[PDB]
Amino acid sequence: ASEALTMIVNLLRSQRPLQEPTVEQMRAGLEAMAQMSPLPADVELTTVDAGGVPGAWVRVPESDPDRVVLYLHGGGYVIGSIRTHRDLAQRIARAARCRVLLIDYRLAPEHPHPAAVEDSTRAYRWLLETGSDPKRMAIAGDAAGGGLTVATLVALRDAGVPLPAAAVCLSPWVDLEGIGESMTTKAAVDPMVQREPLLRMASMYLAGQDPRTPLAAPLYADLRGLPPLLIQVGTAETLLDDSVRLAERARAAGVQVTLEPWEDMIHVWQAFAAMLPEGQQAIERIGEFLRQHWQ
């Protein structure tokens, strides 16, 4: 891997953003880390009420105004915000030549499951109501947001809503019990995600609900009829087997799946694209995938 990977690993091993003693310290810690990758001056952000869900339109000079990605940020359903993910949003807008709607979906523990899925489905329906066309749309998300992307597609399908052209999952979290083999075998090489913090956040999101609840843990959802999926995941991830098991379930349900395992990459390495060449390479691949499915 690039030299930059060792630098990102060293930062994460020291910051340990999922190991802060309070939820507010975890939220503030991630916001502090995100402000290190500051927005290019050509990014336009417009706050919007996306049908009762706060959001930001993210636009760059070559954004096609009629193509839209609904972007669902990661953070265990507990942390993350418009501020933590606006840089990843603008990099995808730039690569896919589209507008991105980055939503502030309700977070746990304040708002347990299914609040996040209620908000993502509301924002997608709002995009349709305000004139976006599914053939020019996609849903994308990282980590918890990658799980939320799959759950959003399932909920929309089940409500008879037309599904978008494609969807993208970056290191998705779809097993809220952490029983994948990699949760053991990759624990040594993962500097960000371990079982104990995942179970902490899963408890906040589930609030005592079955951890195999299909819209919380879409490894247990019916995936038939979903649009083409790109799953990007790093091999230095305890969540590697979340992606592998999701690909298996989706393909078994007839979904076009592209599973891309990136050797030695860490959780949501794309967020470090300002410094990490493999992060920018992975984002260029996301843009290629979306533009292919919008042709």
Side-chain angles (χ1 to χ4, degrees):
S2 62
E3 287 180 54
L5 179 63
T6 288
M7 173 176 70
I8 299 308
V9 171
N10 285 342
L11 175 72
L12 291 172
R13 287 211 187 272
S14 287
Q15 287 303 300
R16 299 184 82 224
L18 299 182
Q19 286 286 11
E20 299 290 346
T22 73
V23 165
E24 285 305 331
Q25 287 176 242
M26 280 203 279
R27 290 175 178 155
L30 191 63
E31 289 224 335
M33 196 180 289
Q35 184 157 3
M36 301 287 286
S37 185
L39 280 196
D42 67 349
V43 181
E44 202 81 313
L45 312 164
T46 307
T47 75
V48 73
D49 177 14
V53 180
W57 284 115
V58 178
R59 188 184 203 121
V60 294
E62 302 310 322
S63 292
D64 178 333
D66 289 303
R67 294 173 176 195
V68 182
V69 171
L70 169 63
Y71 195 86
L72 307 178
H73 69 81
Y77 295 107
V78 172
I79 76 177
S81 69
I82 287 168
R83 283 154 298 288
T84 60
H85 280 72
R86 58 186 174 194
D87 180 59
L88 182 49
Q90 71 84 13
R91 294 181 183 277
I92 291 167
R94 199 178 297 274
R97 296 192 271 284
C98 67
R99 295 194 289 159
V100 174
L101 182 66
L102 180 64
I103 62 166
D104 188 35
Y105 64 82
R106 276 172 295 160
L107 296 171
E110 295 88 342
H111 307 291
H113 179 79
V117 193
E118 291 178 346
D119 287 352
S120 58
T121 60
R122 180 67 199 98
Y124 184 94
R125 295 178 91 151
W126 177 80
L127 284 168
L128 297 181
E129 288 168 25
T130 56
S132 293
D133 299 320
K135 73 176 100 192
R136 284 179 278 279
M137 293 163 72
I139 306 177
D142 58 294
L148 188 55
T149 291
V150 181
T152 302
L153 291 164
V154 170
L156 292 168
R157 186 199 61 220
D158 288 341
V161 182
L163 296 187
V168 177
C169 299
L170 308 186
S171 308
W173 184 31
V174 293
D175 168 15
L176 301 194
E177 296 184 297
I179 62 172
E181 178 167 28
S182 55
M183 189 59 51
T184 303
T185 60
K186 302 291 182 162
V189 296
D190 191 329
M192 200 194 295
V193 181
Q194 298 292 330
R195 194 170 188 248
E196 277 194 68
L198 282 187
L199 291 175
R200 178 186 179 197
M201 290 185 303
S203 162
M204 293 171 182
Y205 186 51
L206 289 167
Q209 292 171 89
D210 181 348
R212 299 191 178 201
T213 292
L215 293 182
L219 184 55
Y220 303 99
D222 189 335
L223 303 186
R224 192 149 302 264
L226 260 55
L229 307 180
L230 173 61
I231 305 164
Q232 289 186 332
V233 63
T235 70
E237 286 209 61
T238 52
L239 290 171
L240 173 57
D241 279 324
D242 282 46
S243 284
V244 174
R245 287 177 291 174
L246 174 63
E248 176 182 39
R249 186 165 190 87
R251 277 295 310 126
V255 176
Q256 194 189 139
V257 180
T258 298
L259 174 64
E260 270 189 5
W262 287 66
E263 190 140 342
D264 296 318
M265 288 303 100
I266 55 74
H267 190 57
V268 198
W269 79 96
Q270 302 92 337
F272 302 91
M275 299 170 270
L276 182 67
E278 292 90 340
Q280 199 43 54
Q281 292 157 30
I283 295 172
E284 289 304 331
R285 178 65 188 120
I286 295 165
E288 178 187 18
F289 176 85
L290 291 174
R291 284 185 283 97
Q292 182 216 317
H293 285 289
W294 287 328
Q295 275 188 296

PDB file of all heavy atoms in Angstrom, residues 148-175:
ATOM      1  N   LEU A 148     -27.307   1.189   6.276  1.00  0.00           N
ATOM      2  CA  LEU A 148     -28.553   1.984   6.128  1.00  0.00           C
ATOM      3  C   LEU A 148     -28.926   2.068   4.650  1.00  0.00           C
ATOM      4  O   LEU A 148     -30.116   2.094   4.346  1.00  0.00           O
ATOM      5  CB  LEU A 148     -28.347   3.372   6.736  1.00  0.00           C
ATOM      6  CG  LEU A 148     -29.602   4.230   6.836  1.00  0.00           C
ATOM      7  CD1 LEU A 148     -30.707   3.537   7.592  1.00  0.00           C
ATOM      8  CD2 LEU A 148     -29.302   5.575   7.490  1.00  0.00           C
ATOM      9  N   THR A 149     -27.956   2.113   3.745  1.00  0.00           N
ATOM     10  CA  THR A 149     -28.234   2.133   2.281  1.00  0.00           C
ATOM     11  C   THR A 149     -29.042   0.888   1.903  1.00  0.00           C
ATOM     12  O   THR A 149     -30.074   1.017   1.231  1.00  0.00           O
ATOM     13  CB  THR A 149     -26.934   2.219   1.479  1.00  0.00           C
ATOM     14  OG1 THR A 149     -26.375   3.515   1.706  1.00  0.00           O
ATOM     15  CG2 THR A 149     -27.126   1.994  -0.002  1.00  0.00           C
ATOM     16  N   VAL A 150     -28.605  -0.275   2.373  1.00  0.00           N
ATOM     17  CA  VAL A 150     -29.309  -1.541   2.021  1.00  0.00           C
ATOM     18  C   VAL A 150     -30.693  -1.517   2.659  1.00  0.00           C
ATOM     19  O   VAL A 150     -31.680  -1.840   1.983  1.00  0.00           O
ATOM     20  CB  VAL A 150     -28.517  -2.770   2.445  1.00  0.00           C
ATOM     21  CG1 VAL A 150     -29.242  -4.055   2.061  1.00  0.00           C
ATOM     22  CG2 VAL A 150     -27.129  -2.761   1.848  1.00  0.00           C
ATOM     23  N   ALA A 151     -30.778  -1.165   3.930  1.00  0.00           N
ATOM     24  CA  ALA A 151     -32.080  -1.128   4.629  1.00  0.00           C
ATOM     25  C   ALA A 151     -33.021  -0.140   3.942  1.00  0.00           C
ATOM     26  O   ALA A 151     -34.216  -0.449   3.817  1.00  0.00           O
ATOM     27  CB  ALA A 151     -31.878  -0.804   6.079  1.00  0.00           C
ATOM     28  N   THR A 152     -32.528   1.013   3.503  1.00  0.00           N
ATOM     29  CA  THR A 152     -33.339   2.037   2.798  1.00  0.00           C
ATOM     30  C   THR A 152     -33.898   1.440   1.502  1.00  0.00           C
ATOM     31  O   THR A 152     -35.098   1.617   1.220  1.00  0.00           O
ATOM     32  CB  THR A 152     -32.526   3.299   2.516  1.00  0.00           C
ATOM     33  OG1 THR A 152     -32.062   3.788   3.771  1.00  0.00           O
ATOM     34  CG2 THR A 152     -33.331   4.372   1.828  1.00  0.00           C
ATOM     35  N   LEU A 153     -33.065   0.745   0.739  1.00  0.00           N
ATOM     36  CA  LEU A 153     -33.528   0.118  -0.524  1.00  0.00           C
ATOM     37  C   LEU A 153     -34.626  -0.897  -0.211  1.00  0.00           C
ATOM     38  O   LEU A 153     -35.627  -0.922  -0.934  1.00  0.00           O
ATOM     39  CB  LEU A 153     -32.350  -0.548  -1.234  1.00  0.00           C
ATOM     40  CG  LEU A 153     -31.331   0.437  -1.800  1.00  0.00           C
ATOM     41  CD1 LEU A 153     -30.050  -0.298  -2.113  1.00  0.00           C
ATOM     42  CD2 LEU A 153     -31.901   1.180  -3.001  1.00  0.00           C
ATOM     43  N   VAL A 154     -34.420  -1.736   0.785  1.00  0.00           N
ATOM     44  CA  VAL A 154     -35.437  -2.768   1.157  1.00  0.00           C
ATOM     45  C   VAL A 154     -36.737  -2.057   1.546  1.00  0.00           C
ATOM     46  O   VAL A 154     -37.809  -2.442   1.057  1.00  0.00           O
ATOM     47  CB  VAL A 154     -34.909  -3.654   2.289  1.00  0.00           C
ATOM     48  CG1 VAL A 154     -35.987  -4.547   2.861  1.00  0.00           C
ATOM     49  CG2 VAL A 154     -33.748  -4.488   1.826  1.00  0.00           C
ATOM     50  N   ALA A 155     -36.684  -1.059   2.409  1.00  0.00           N
ATOM     51  CA  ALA A 155     -37.900  -0.351   2.875  1.00  0.00           C
ATOM     52  C   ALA A 155     -38.600   0.322   1.694  1.00  0.00           C
ATOM     53  O   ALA A 155     -39.839   0.253   1.620  1.00  0.00           O
ATOM     54  CB  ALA A 155     -37.538   0.640   3.946  1.00  0.00           C
ATOM     55  N   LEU A 156     -37.869   0.998   0.807  1.00  0.00           N
ATOM     56  CA  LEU A 156     -38.454   1.658  -0.378  1.00  0.00           C
ATOM     57  C   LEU A 156     -39.125   0.605  -1.264  1.00  0.00           C
ATOM     58  O   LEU A 156     -40.277   0.816  -1.722  1.00  0.00           O
ATOM     59  CB  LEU A 156     -37.383   2.405  -1.169  1.00  0.00           C
ATOM     60  CG  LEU A 156     -36.793   3.629  -0.466  1.00  0.00           C
ATOM     61  CD1 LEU A 156     -35.563   4.072  -1.239  1.00  0.00           C
ATOM     62  CD2 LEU A 156     -37.806   4.761  -0.364  1.00  0.00           C
ATOM     63  N   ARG A 157     -38.437  -0.503  -1.522  1.00  0.00           N
ATOM     64  CA  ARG A 157     -38.982  -1.577  -2.389  1.00  0.00           C
ATOM     65  C   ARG A 157     -40.322  -2.038  -1.806  1.00  0.00           C
ATOM     66  O   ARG A 157     -41.322  -2.150  -2.555  1.00  0.00           O
ATOM     67  CB  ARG A 157     -38.013  -2.754  -2.487  1.00  0.00           C
ATOM     68  CG  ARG A 157     -38.460  -3.814  -3.485  1.00  0.00           C
ATOM     69  CD  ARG A 157     -37.756  -5.130  -3.221  1.00  0.00           C
ATOM     70  NE  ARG A 157     -38.055  -5.651  -1.907  1.00  0.00           N
ATOM     71  CZ  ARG A 157     -37.209  -6.232  -1.107  1.00  0.00           C
ATOM     72  NH1 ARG A 157     -35.955  -6.344  -1.512  1.00  0.00           N
ATOM     73  NH2 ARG A 157     -37.546  -6.594   0.149  1.00  0.00           N
ATOM     74  N   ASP A 158     -40.351  -2.275  -0.506  1.00  0.00           N
ATOM     75  CA  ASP A 158     -41.513  -2.880   0.191  1.00  0.00           C
ATOM     76  C   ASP A 158     -42.675  -1.891   0.188  1.00  0.00           C
ATOM     77  O   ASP A 158     -43.827  -2.337   0.302  1.00  0.00           O
ATOM     78  CB  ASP A 158     -41.109  -3.322   1.585  1.00  0.00           C
ATOM     79  CG  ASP A 158     -40.204  -4.541   1.583  1.00  0.00           C
ATOM     80  OD1 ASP A 158     -40.175  -5.260   0.553  1.00  0.00           O
ATOM     81  OD2 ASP A 158     -39.531  -4.763   2.616  1.00  0.00           O
ATOM     82  N   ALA A 159     -42.407  -0.594   0.026  1.00  0.00           N
ATOM     83  CA  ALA A 159     -43.434   0.473  -0.027  1.00  0.00           C
ATOM     84  C   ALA A 159     -43.848   0.777  -1.472  1.00  0.00           C
ATOM     85  O   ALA A 159     -44.592   1.750  -1.674  1.00  0.00           O
ATOM     86  CB  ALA A 159     -42.923   1.712   0.664  1.00  0.00           C
ATOM     87  N   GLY A 160     -43.396  -0.009  -2.446  1.00  0.00           N
ATOM     88  CA  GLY A 160     -43.714   0.187  -3.876  1.00  0.00           C
ATOM     89  C   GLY A 160     -43.111   1.453  -4.456  1.00  0.00           C
ATOM     90  O   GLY A 160     -43.655   1.992  -5.429  1.00  0.00           O
ATOM     91  N   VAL A 161     -42.034   1.966  -3.852  1.00  0.00           N
ATOM     92  CA  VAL A 161     -41.331   3.167  -4.364  1.00  0.00           C
ATOM     93  C   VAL A 161     -40.356   2.712  -5.435  1.00  0.00           C
ATOM     94  O   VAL A 161     -39.644   1.743  -5.227  1.00  0.00           O
ATOM     95  CB  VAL A 161     -40.619   3.931  -3.236  1.00  0.00           C
ATOM     96  CG1 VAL A 161     -39.948   5.185  -3.753  1.00  0.00           C
ATOM     97  CG2 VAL A 161     -41.558   4.269  -2.094  1.00  0.00           C
ATOM     98  N   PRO A 162     -40.255   3.420  -6.581  1.00  0.00           N
ATOM     99  CA  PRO A 162     -39.262   3.061  -7.585  1.00  0.00           C
ATOM    100  C   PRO A 162     -37.836   3.218  -7.063  1.00  0.00           C
ATOM    101  O   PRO A 162     -37.488   4.243  -6.519  1.00  0.00           O
ATOM    102  CB  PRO A 162     -39.549   4.012  -8.746  1.00  0.00           C
ATOM    103  CG  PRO A 162     -40.293   5.148  -8.139  1.00  0.00           C
ATOM    104  CD  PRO A 162     -41.093   4.550  -7.003  1.00  0.00           C
ATOM    105  N   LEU A 163     -37.050   2.170  -7.240  1.00  0.00           N
ATOM    106  CA  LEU A 163     -35.667   2.099  -6.745  1.00  0.00           C
ATOM    107  C   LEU A 163     -34.742   2.849  -7.702  1.00  0.00           C
ATOM    108  O   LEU A 163     -35.029   2.973  -8.897  1.00  0.00           O
ATOM    109  CB  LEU A 163     -35.256   0.643  -6.598  1.00  0.00           C
ATOM    110  CG  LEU A 163     -36.041  -0.151  -5.568  1.00  0.00           C
ATOM    111  CD1 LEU A 163     -35.425  -1.522  -5.392  1.00  0.00           C
ATOM    112  CD2 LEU A 163     -36.067   0.571  -4.233  1.00  0.00           C
ATOM    113  N   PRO A 164     -33.600   3.341  -7.188  1.00  0.00           N
ATOM    114  CA  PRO A 164     -32.658   4.120  -7.993  1.00  0.00           C
ATOM    115  C   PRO A 164     -31.852   3.221  -8.932  1.00  0.00           C
ATOM    116  O   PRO A 164     -31.984   1.961  -8.898  1.00  0.00           O
ATOM    117  CB  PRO A 164     -31.758   4.788  -6.933  1.00  0.00           C
ATOM    118  CG  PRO A 164     -31.743   3.759  -5.815  1.00  0.00           C
ATOM    119  CD  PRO A 164     -33.154   3.206  -5.790  1.00  0.00           C
ATOM    120  N   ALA A 165     -31.015   3.858  -9.750  1.00  0.00           N
ATOM    121  CA  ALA A 165     -30.216   3.170 -10.784  1.00  0.00           C
ATOM    122  C   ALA A 165     -29.171   2.252 -10.162  1.00  0.00           C
ATOM    123  O   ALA A 165     -28.824   1.235 -10.787  1.00  0.00           O
ATOM    124  CB  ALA A 165     -29.559   4.176 -11.676  1.00  0.00           C
ATOM    125  N   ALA A 166     -28.653   2.593  -8.982  1.00  0.00           N
ATOM    126  CA  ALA A 166     -27.533   1.857  -8.385  1.00  0.00           C
ATOM    127  C   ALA A 166     -27.376   2.254  -6.928  1.00  0.00           C
ATOM    128  O   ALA A 166     -28.016   3.236  -6.498  1.00  0.00           O
ATOM    129  CB  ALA A 166     -26.267   2.113  -9.156  1.00  0.00           C
ATOM    130  N   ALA A 167     -26.569   1.515  -6.192  1.00  0.00           N
ATOM    131  CA  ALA A 167     -26.272   1.860  -4.801  1.00  0.00           C
ATOM    132  C   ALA A 167     -24.843   1.473  -4.501  1.00  0.00           C
ATOM    133  O   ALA A 167     -24.265   0.591  -5.171  1.00  0.00           O
ATOM    134  CB  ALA A 167     -27.227   1.211  -3.853  1.00  0.00           C
ATOM    135  N   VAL A 168     -24.275   2.151  -3.508  1.00  0.00           N
ATOM    136  CA  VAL A 168     -22.846   1.981  -3.164  1.00  0.00           C
ATOM    137  C   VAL A 168     -22.726   1.863  -1.651  1.00  0.00           C
ATOM    138  O   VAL A 168     -23.277   2.714  -0.940  1.00  0.00           O
ATOM    139  CB  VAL A 168     -22.010   3.171  -3.654  1.00  0.00           C
ATOM    140  CG1 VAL A 168     -20.571   3.000  -3.216  1.00  0.00           C
ATOM    141  CG2 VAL A 168     -22.113   3.339  -5.158  1.00  0.00           C
ATOM    142  N   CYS A 169     -22.002   0.862  -1.178  1.00  0.00           N
ATOM    143  CA  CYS A 169     -21.760   0.584   0.258  1.00  0.00           C
ATOM    144  C   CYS A 169     -20.256   0.600   0.482  1.00  0.00           C
ATOM    145  O   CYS A 169     -19.554  -0.180  -0.174  1.00  0.00           O
ATOM    146  CB  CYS A 169     -22.300  -0.777   0.673  1.00  0.00           C
ATOM    147  SG  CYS A 169     -24.083  -0.956   0.445  1.00  0.00           S
ATOM    148  N   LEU A 170     -19.772   1.469   1.367  1.00  0.00           N
ATOM    149  CA  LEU A 170     -18.328   1.548   1.695  1.00  0.00           C
ATOM    150  C   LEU A 170     -18.135   0.915   3.072  1.00  0.00           C
ATOM    151  O   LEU A 170     -18.611   1.502   4.058  1.00  0.00           O
ATOM    152  CB  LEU A 170     -17.881   3.020   1.665  1.00  0.00           C
ATOM    153  CG  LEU A 170     -18.212   3.825   0.409  1.00  0.00           C
ATOM    154  CD1 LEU A 170     -17.565   5.207   0.488  1.00  0.00           C
ATOM    155  CD2 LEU A 170     -17.812   3.108  -0.869  1.00  0.00           C
ATOM    156  N   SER A 171     -17.495  -0.245   3.162  1.00  0.00           N
ATOM    157  CA  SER A 171     -17.241  -0.942   4.444  1.00  0.00           C
ATOM    158  C   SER A 171     -18.543  -1.050   5.233  1.00  0.00           C
ATOM    159  O   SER A 171     -18.577  -0.665   6.399  1.00  0.00           O
ATOM    160  CB  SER A 171     -16.207  -0.228   5.286  1.00  0.00           C
ATOM    161  OG  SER A 171     -15.010   0.049   4.575  1.00  0.00           O
ATOM    162  N   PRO A 172     -19.650  -1.572   4.660  1.00  0.00           N
ATOM    163  CA  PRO A 172     -20.930  -1.566   5.365  1.00  0.00           C
ATOM    164  C   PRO A 172     -20.929  -2.393   6.644  1.00  0.00           C
ATOM    165  O   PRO A 172     -20.294  -3.429   6.724  1.00  0.00           O
ATOM    166  CB  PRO A 172     -21.914  -2.181   4.353  1.00  0.00           C
ATOM    167  CG  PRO A 172     -21.024  -3.004   3.460  1.00  0.00           C
ATOM    168  CD  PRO A 172     -19.781  -2.160   3.316  1.00  0.00           C
ATOM    169  N   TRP A 173     -21.690  -1.905   7.617  1.00  0.00           N
ATOM    170  CA  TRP A 173     -21.954  -2.597   8.892  1.00  0.00           C
ATOM    171  C   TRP A 173     -23.365  -3.187   8.816  1.00  0.00           C
ATOM    172  O   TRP A 173     -24.341  -2.417   8.846  1.00  0.00           O
ATOM    173  CB  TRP A 173     -21.802  -1.646  10.066  1.00  0.00           C
ATOM    174  CG  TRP A 173     -21.977  -2.335  11.378  1.00  0.00           C
ATOM    175  CD1 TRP A 173     -21.681  -3.628  11.697  1.00  0.00           C
ATOM    176  CD2 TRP A 173     -22.426  -1.715  12.588  1.00  0.00           C
ATOM    177  NE1 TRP A 173     -21.930  -3.867  13.017  1.00  0.00           N
ATOM    178  CE2 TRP A 173     -22.390  -2.706  13.588  1.00  0.00           C
ATOM    179  CE3 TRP A 173     -22.890  -0.435  12.908  1.00  0.00           C
ATOM    180  CZ2 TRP A 173     -22.795  -2.445  14.892  1.00  0.00           C
ATOM    181  CZ3 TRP A 173     -23.270  -0.172  14.206  1.00  0.00           C
ATOM    182  CH2 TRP A 173     -23.220  -1.165  15.183  1.00  0.00           C
ATOM    183  N   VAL A 174     -23.465  -4.507   8.668  1.00  0.00           N
ATOM    184  CA  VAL A 174     -24.779  -5.179   8.466  1.00  0.00           C
ATOM    185  C   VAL A 174     -25.026  -6.298   9.482  1.00  0.00           C
ATOM    186  O   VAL A 174     -26.159  -6.782   9.480  1.00  0.00           O
ATOM    187  CB  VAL A 174     -24.948  -5.702   7.033  1.00  0.00           C
ATOM    188  CG1 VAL A 174     -25.024  -4.554   6.048  1.00  0.00           C
ATOM    189  CG2 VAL A 174     -23.886  -6.710   6.653  1.00  0.00           C
ATOM    190  N   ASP A 175     -24.044  -6.649  10.308  1.00  0.00           N
ATOM    191  CA  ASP A 175     -24.112  -7.679  11.381  1.00  0.00           C
ATOM    192  C   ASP A 175     -23.914  -6.984  12.719  1.00  0.00           C
ATOM    193  O   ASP A 175     -22.762  -6.662  13.065  1.00  0.00           O
ATOM    194  CB  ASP A 175     -23.039  -8.746  11.175  1.00  0.00           C
ATOM    195  CG  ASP A 175     -22.829  -9.688  12.349  1.00  0.00           C
ATOM    196  OD1 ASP A 175     -23.689  -9.717  13.240  1.00  0.00           O
ATOM    197  OD2 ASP A 175     -21.784 -10.369  12.346  1.00  0.00           O
TER     198      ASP A 175
END
